[PDB]
Design a protein around this ligand. Structure first.
Ligand SMILES: *[C@H]1O[C@H](CO)[C@@H](O[C@@H]2O[C@H](CO)[C@@H](O)[C@H](O)[C@H]2NC(C)=O)[C@H](O)[C@H]1NC(C)=O
Lengths: 329, 315
């Protein structure tokens, strides 16, 4: 800050914050902040009177938040909850003084993915983040977007201190699969949009956060219909045939080995091909889906979605397809 | 399992049973009394797709044996003296789809006093265009040696795109021609035709047409020398080359020329229909019938040369 704004400031601040992210920061201001600040002494910066801050401390305190240098999926109901607590502080800042402070204070003792994930969503949705452009995920946390080989090649570059660029590969045994329409899935661009798309309109949004995203519902319907078409075309251009729809009662015919690795975490598990779906402990039962899919499918077939009271809310009308997306994603 | 079997009570008859066995798959206990099926007949088996699934399986029972021999030596394929200088196709490899007409008459019953109306069937069949081989090549030997001209057309890449190996592809190649010629004592340039292939046969004369003709030499004195057709073992000339793509594919052409005097070291003899000793003595598919682990070798015998060709499909 300029005990405020700029943007080539706001901006600077951000680049510092997501610089070497798997290691304590090297930018000194970020550290005395990191040390000196107390998110709890002038609940005023906070439009909540700092209930959000006060909740994260509580957890950082009982030290019940996920550890640093460990992995993180946004599909973990707790990891998510923790990542999203950071979003609610950064969210209720009146100005840069409260953001930098917090993403500095926190950056330094909350885990990286919760952190990477909170800083981005926050920058994207909060009032205070206008001027900024976020660096591309692919360069901030490259392990999610580069291969496993280039990663190891880069680890060696570093061991030996001799530089240089390595050329990446493509997945399976090209000329042996349908890792022929790979160029599409594996692109750092689509992978970027896919993540952004869902940071722009998150599945977890409540309108307490501030405004309402408009038709995420159709927006969900549509974005995916697009990747599914866009995908189906590439498979056309490759003498391949449109894709199979998946069912829970059948084998997952087509499995792959991703060859990708986590930074802290191990390599991504692989899937053998012609496998039978198993009931996965913790998440949900396979049949649990099969019934979900029917409750779904009956709302489409009935003409109405029925809520909690047994109210039937009609969907044979234009808002239709969006109440369906709210129930389906 | 033919009658030359040494133990038929033990080894039975895989192939032939395998034809009846695939045919009643329509009715094995015979509850419906359906007739026999497309595979239980030779003029009709090539129709049903398992026909080729069933000969792929017979096919590698043989390769299992076929492959147990030790590979061939340099000294093995070498017909010292001769060397192929070059190989060229004088023309174009072009395949298209022609049209044919055979007659449906013996099919409908006409009894009597009722007269014959000429009914016909028109089919669509493949074709290619005549082309010529110009095989340029020197006999370093002192003078004139007999030669087996062997010509295979093997593939090159996978359909995965992959690009196989003369081990991966030695087995997949089909013979296009095999003929015996003498080689001069110096640089000749043999040229030879789509049309003279030894594995091919022309379409045959119509039924009628051989009636017309038979009849005319009866009321006329004598002849019928159409010897052109009293055996014809081969495949259709139309089927000489494969169909390929309209973009074109490049196949690999192998001309290996082996030594006539040892080949025919003893003797139609093409369709030995009547007892006639097959004339070539090399085993069959020579010399691609054996594991060829290092190509390193086929490559350094003077009398084997490979060149790529390209076939195109007219729409
Ligand atoms: C990775 O592919 C690139 C293509 O960008 C190759 O980099 C080339 O290096 C060659 C050396 O053979 C040069 O002739 C090209 O000018 C290079 N281009 C950049 C069109 O560097 C590279 O060879 C590949 N492999 C490494 C086996 O980097």
């Amino acid at each position: 800050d300029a005990l405020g704004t700029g943007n080539a400031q706001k901006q600077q601040d951000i680049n510092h914050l997501l610089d070497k992210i798997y290691e304590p920061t090297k930018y000194p201001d970020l550290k005395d902040i990191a040390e000196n600040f107390n998110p709890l002494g002038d609940t005023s910066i906070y439009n909540d009177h700092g209930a959000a801050v006060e909740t994260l401390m509580k957890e950082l305190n009982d030290h019940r938040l996920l550890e640093q240098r460990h992995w993180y999926s946004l599909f973990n109901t707790r990891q998510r909850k923790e990542a999203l607590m950071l979003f609610a502080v950064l969210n209720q800042c009146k100005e840069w003084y409260c953001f930098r402070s917090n993403a500095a204070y926190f950056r330094e003792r909350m885990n990286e993915g919760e952190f990477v994930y909170a800083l981005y969503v926050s920058v994207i949705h909060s009032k205070l983040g206008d001027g900024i452009v976020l660096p591309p995920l692919y360069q901030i946390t490259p392990h999610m977007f580069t291969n496993s080989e280039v990663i190891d090649k880069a680890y060696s570059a570093k061991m030996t201190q001799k530089p240089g660029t390595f050329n990446v590969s493509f997945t399976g045994t090209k000329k042996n699969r349908e890792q022929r329409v790979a160029y599409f899935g594996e692109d750092i661009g689509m992978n970027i949009h896919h993540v952004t798309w869902h940071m722009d309109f998150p599945f977890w949004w409540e309108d307490s956060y501030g405004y309402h995203l408009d038709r995420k519902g159709e927006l969900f319907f549509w974005v995916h219909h697009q990747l599914t078409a866009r995908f189906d075309f590439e498979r056309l251009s490759n003498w391949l045939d449109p894709v199979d729809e998946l069912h829970w009662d059948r084998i997952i015919r087509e499995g792959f080995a991703p060859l990708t690795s986590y930074k802290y975490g191990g390599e991504f598990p692989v899937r053998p091909d012609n496998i039978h779906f198993e009931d996965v402990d913790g998440v949900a039962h396979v049949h649990d889906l099969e019934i979900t899919e029917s409750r779904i499918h009956e709302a489409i077939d009935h003409g109405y979605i029925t809520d909690s009271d047994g109210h039937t809310i009609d969907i044979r009308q234009p808002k239709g397809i969006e109440l369906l997306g709210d129930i389906i994603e | 399992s033919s009658k030359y079997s040494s133990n038929v009570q033990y080894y039975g008859s895989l192939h032939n049973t395998a034809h009846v066995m695939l045919g009643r798959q329509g009715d094995p206990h015979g509850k419906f009394n359906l007739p026999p099926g497309v595979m239980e007949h030779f003029e009709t088996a090539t129709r049903d797709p398992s026909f080729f699934r069933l000969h792929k399986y017979m096919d590698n029972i043989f390769k299992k044996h076929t492959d147990s021999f030790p590979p061939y030596t340099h000294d093995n394929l070498e017909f010292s003296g001769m060397v192929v200088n070059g190989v060229a196709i004088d023309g174009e490899l072009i395949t298209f789809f022609d049209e044919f007409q055979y007659s449906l008459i013996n099919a409908v019953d006409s009894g009597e006093n009722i007269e014959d109306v000429e009914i016909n069937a028109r089919v669509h069949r493949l074709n290619h265009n005549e082309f010529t081989y110009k095989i340029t090549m020197s006999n370093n030997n002192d003078g004139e040696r007999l030669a087996t001209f062997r010509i295979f057309l093997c593939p090159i890449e996978d359909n995965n795109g992959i690009t196989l190996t003369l081990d991966e592809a030695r087995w997949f190649c089909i013979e296009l021609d095999k003929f015996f010629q003498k080689v001069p004592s110096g640089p000749e340039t043999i040229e030879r035709s789509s049309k003279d292939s030894s594995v091919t046969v022309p379409d045959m004369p119509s039924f009628q047409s051989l009636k017309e003709q038979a009849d005319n030499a009866v009321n006329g004195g004598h002849d019928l020398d159409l010897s052109a057709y009293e055996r014809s073992c081969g495949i259709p000339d139309r089927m000489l080359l494969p169909k390929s793509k309209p973009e074109g594919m490049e196949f690999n052409l192998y001309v290996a020329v082996t030594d006539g005097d040892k080949d025919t070291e003893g003797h139609h003899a093409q369709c030995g229909v009547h007892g006639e000793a097959y004339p070539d003595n090399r085993p069959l598919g020579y010399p691609l019938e054996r594991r060829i682990p290092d190509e390193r070798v086929i490559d350094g015998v003077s009398n084997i040369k490979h060149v790529v060709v390209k076939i195109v499909h007219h729409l």
